[PDB]
């Protein structure tokens, strides 16, 4: 009983870890993609401004 319950609890913890990792990495990808619209897209837009 103890072995099964402890293993189940720790698998619960590990699956929670995986879920939270995926969630945070998705949020980080959104933030960094948006930021890339602020440094790289910044220089692209500067080129657009000068050409226009």
């Amino acid at each position: 009983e103890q072995e099964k319950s402890n293993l189940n609890i720790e698998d619960d913890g590990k699956k929670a870890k995986e879920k939270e990792d995926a969630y945070f990495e998705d949020i980080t990808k959104n933030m960094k993609q948006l930021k890339t619209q602020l440094k790289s897209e910044y220089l692209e837009k500067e080129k657009a401004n000068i050409q226009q």
Partner: protein, 53 residues
Amino acid sequence: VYKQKIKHLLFQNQDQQSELKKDVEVTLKQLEDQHRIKSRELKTDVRSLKVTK
């Protein structure tokens, strides 16, 4: 006697299950706090660069 002893070291099971639950909860809290800190730092950088843009 033996039935109550099963209502006992089952006490060991209770204590160790509670230990694992609290360990999982606290590690979850630590990881989530780290996530929130990094999220706010990244959002600060994003906001500062959006202001410049």
